[PDB]
Write a protein that binds this ligand. Structure first.
Ligand SMILES: CC(C)[C@H](NC(=O)COCCNC(=O)OC(C)(C)C)C(=O)N[C@@H](CC(=O)O)Cc1ccc(NC(=O)[C@H](Cc2ccccc2Cl)NC(=O)C(F)(F)c2ccccc2)cc1
Lengths: 104, 102
């Protein structure tokens, strides 16, 4: 009912540091979600390592909370299946890291 | 030049105020570009250089820093062609996390 064309070839941004994930008070890991019926097909989702957050001393402090920061994202989904380059839009949620948080 | 078709009827999916309770809270700044789809984009900005205490005072021995993501956005191509588009990859701060320096 409303349809458009898109060139998936790309240009822009170099990178670096980005071990925020390891020095955060609310650190995380990245889990690969691969779906071949989907553009992009590889997506990296963040997952908080602890319930609590990390001390100065480097011990977990459960009076606080690692929680994930999320984003609504649009992704491409094959429509109909078996059709290698026709697609519909699909909105989804993506954890991109965790932040630490006071519970009240 | 690999090219594909997209139906913009978007089904399906699928308050939480972490921005205010984070040790490394932040605000959102509007970026608007009319030659861009989406045109309005909200970018996060850490409120403090340091992070917030239990006591609720700023502790500069630590660091609010933004968490970013690579994002794709659409740009008409050729310009003034209302259906055909090219991809453009962008960085987006979506919130801040607190961090131990070196
Ligand atoms: C992202 C929207 C879901 C959101 N809008 C809504 O909830 C409803 O959208 C109704 C208007 N947007 C719209 O039609 O999107 C297009 C005009 C596109 C068609 C919105 O506009 N948010 C914005 C305002 C704000 O809220 O601060 C912030 C925003 C901006 C762009 C993006 N970009 C995307 O989600 C794109 C979708 C896309 C865009 C352009 C070209 C190709 C593709 Cl596949 N996908 C990706 O970046 C990704 F798939 F690569 C991806 C995957 C995994 C992790 C990270 C990224 C995300 C969020």
């Amino acid at each position: 009912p409303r349809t458009v064309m898109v060139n998936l070839n790309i240009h822009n941004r170099p990178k670096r540091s980005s071990d925020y994930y390891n020095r955060s008070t609310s650190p995380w890991n990245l889990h690969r979600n691969e779906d071949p019926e989907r553009y992009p097909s590889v997506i990296w989702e963040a997952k908080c390592r602890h319930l609590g957050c990390i001390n100065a001393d480097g011990n977990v402090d459960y009076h606080m909370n690692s929680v994930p920061i999320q984003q609504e994202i649009l992704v491409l989904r094959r429509e109909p299946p078996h059709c290698p380059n026709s697609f519909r839009l699909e909105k989804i949620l993506v954890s991109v890291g965790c932040t630490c948080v006071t519970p009240i």
